[PDB]
Each structure stands twice: as C-alpha cells, then as structure tokens.
Design a protein around this ligand. Sequence first.
Ligand SMILES: CC(C)CCC[C@@H](C)[C@H]1CC[C@H]2[C@@H]3CC=C4C[C@@H](O)CC[C@]4(C)[C@H]3CC[C@]12C
Ligand SMILES: CC[C@@H](CO)NC(=O)[C@@H]1C=C2c3cccc4[nH]cc(c34)C[C@H]2N(C)C1
Length: 390
Amino acid sequence: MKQIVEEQGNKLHWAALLILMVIIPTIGGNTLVILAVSLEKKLQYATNYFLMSLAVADLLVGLFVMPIALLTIMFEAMWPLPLVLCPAWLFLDVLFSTASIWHLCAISVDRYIAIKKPIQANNSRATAFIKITVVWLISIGIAIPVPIKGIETDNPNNITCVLTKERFGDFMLFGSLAAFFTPLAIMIVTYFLTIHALQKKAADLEDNWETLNDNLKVIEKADNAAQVKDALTKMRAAALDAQKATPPKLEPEMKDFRHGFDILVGQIDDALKLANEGKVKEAQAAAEQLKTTRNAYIQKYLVQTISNEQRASKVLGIVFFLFLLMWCPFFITNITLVLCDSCNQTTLQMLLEIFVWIGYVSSGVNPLVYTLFNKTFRDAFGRYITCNYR
Ligand SMILES: CC(C)CCC[C@@H](C)[C@H]1CC[C@H]2[C@@H]3CC=C4C[C@@H](O)CC[C@]4(C)[C@H]3CC[C@]12C
Ligand SMILES: CC[C@@H](CO)NC(=O)[C@@H]1C=C2c3cccc4[nH]cc(c34)C[C@H]2N(C)C1
C-alpha cells in the first residue's frame, strides 16, 4: 500500500520536554539532598544516611538510565550504542528503579518502629548500613535476570533494546510483583498499623494523665500515710510511663517539655521521702506543688507528642502515596501485557514507553519533595541554589 505512509518522523520536542521537566529536576534535586547530608553537620545521623542512599539511587537514574532512555526515542528503530551496553543499561534501569521503591518501604517500616518502640536509639550507624545493604542486595537480585538471560541477538548487529513478552514474559510478571507490588502491600499494612499505633499511644497517654490527677485527689483527701505512699509510687510509674513514649531530647533550640517528668519524678521522690519519715502534713503540701510542674510541662507535652506524631505521619503517607500512585500506570500496564493476549501489544508497548517517564520523575524528585518538609534541609537548599555553602 503506497497510501500507507508510516513517517515516524520526529520526536525531538519530547526529548527537550523530558530534559527540562524530568531529567534536570532529578539530577539537581538529588544533588541537593546529597550536598545537605554531606556538608551540614546538623543533618548527619542514622536516618539521613539511608535517605542519602536513596538520593544516590535516584541520582544514578537521571545520570545513566534516563539519558540513554532518550536515545530510544530519537532512534526508536535500532539500538545505536554498542551491543554490550544494551544489557548493561537494562540492568541499571531495573536496579535503580527497584532500589528507589524498596528504600521507601524500609523508611515506612522504620517510621512505624520509631512510633511503637521509641526506646532504641544510637538505630545506630551499623543498623543503617545493614538496612542500606539489604535494600541494595534485594534490588540486585531482582535486576539480575536481565543481563543473565540477555538480549535476543548470526546478526547484522541489529539490536532492539526491549524486554519482549516472548523472552522475559515470566520476568515482567514476577519481577513487578517483587519490585513494586510486594513493597506496595507492605506499606498498606504498615499504614493501618500506624493508625492503630498512634491511637493506642494517645489512649495510653490519656490514662497516664488521669492516673496523675486522680492520685493527687487521693493524696489531698488522704487521712493515712500508707495511702500517700502507694499514691506517689503509682504517680512515679505513670510519669515514667508517659515519658518513655518519646525519644530523649538528647536525640530544638526552644523549650523541651519532656524534661518536666525528670522534674516531676524528682519532687515525687522527695515527697515520698517525707512520707517515709512520717511527715504527712508536710508531704501533702509538696504534692500540691506537683500541680505547678504539671500545669507547665506535662500538659503541653501530651498535645505536642500526639500532634507532632500525627502531622508527621500524615505528610509521610501523602508523599509515599503519590510516589506509588505515579508508578502504578507502568506496572499495572506491564502486568496486563503478559496476562492479556487479546490486547494489542503494539500500542501496549507504546504506553509503557510513556508511563516509565511518569515513574522516572516520580522516583527522581521523590527525595526532594520528602526533604522539603524539614526546615534544616530547606534552609540548606536555599543557600545551595544561590551557590553560598560555607
Ligand atoms: C542536558 C542535561 C541532561 C545536562 C545538564 C543538566 C545538569 C548537568 C545541570 C542542569 C542544572 C544543574 C544544577 C543547577 C543547580 C544546582 C545548584 C548548585 O548549588 C549545585 C549544582 C546544581 C544542582 C546544578 C548541577 C548540574 C545541573 C543539574
Ligand atoms: C518502556 C521501555 C522498556 C523496554 O523494554 N523498558 C521497560 O519496560 C523497563 C522495565 C523495568 C522493569 C521491568 C520489570 C520489573 C521491574 N522492576 C523495576 C523495573 C522493572 C524497572 C522497569 N523499567 C523502568 C522499565
């Protein structure tokens, strides 16, 4: 058919679109995160070492994967680079993309552990390296079938760098399950686990609050010393119990309310030492002054603890939701490409060519968006874009 003219002429304007909107924001966005953790001494702790690893994983996407992904648009007919670069590029493409997804899955669980068990800390430098290594080891095992099986290449060196359904059909199915849907399910579970964790934490703080106040009236209306003795001990327990629901202020220039329990317990011990000697009327007067410590520190500590754990949980879910949501158009399409044979797989491959760039920008700017809710990071970025540093 001479009428049938598949020009397939030019797509340079789309490459300029992807550099300006996807590639540059990826490279620059992750360089700033790396710069911040590296040369800002106030940002160097166990969490940001894992976050910097994520920034490296996404910086390597826009530095190696995404630039060569444009040559598949300019020269969609045939692979221009040497043959050995085609399995290498596909390998790094699966490696780094999986490393970004599994990084957030670990961060999501780490944040949940920090809510259920705030005691463990200094979560040392080694615990970070263990988590870093495992994530990178998981991603290698998922990206390793690509170079092992290899391109489908006698040959005129005519190579199409693509994951065909005939050759990698079993990989595209189970490789999407392990790399995307498995950490997706984990983050759904840890989501509802966090809702239950923040509510159980608030209800316990509420009962510790009532325990203190109820025992105060027990002390005031007390007639016997033995009643005051087992009323301050129960207060001292509930005071330490509510204080253990928050990591020490050791681990911020403004007021620290968590110290009010150190003050509270110290007074309770003295007021109980008076109860041990027998000075009841003098001990009840000291328990009345426990309200001064309560009205100043304890009252605003309970709201500051619940509100901050609630706000940080909501913003962490949103940014981890949009990341997963923008990677959904690719993997859902990638699965049905194998599990649907009625579908036209020519246009179904065209959609994968588009949906990857939705996921690329989703991974590339993901560390930047996440760090733009930490003021120390933002103030560092504002000095870097003006080329200030120190
Ligand atoms: C055509 C494209 C792919 C190549 C050019 C893009 C890269 C090399 C350029 C474009 C914009 C540049 C960034 C612009 C802003 C800054 C802020 C500065 O404090 C650190 C470097 C950094 C982050 C630059 C790094 C290099 C950069 C990312
Ligand atoms: C659109 C052009 C085609 C060429 O084959 N490229 C792909 O489908 C590429 C296949 C990939 C892939 C597959 C199966 C499992 C996976 N886990 C992580 C990835 C992954 C990364 C993904 N990259 C982004 C796209």
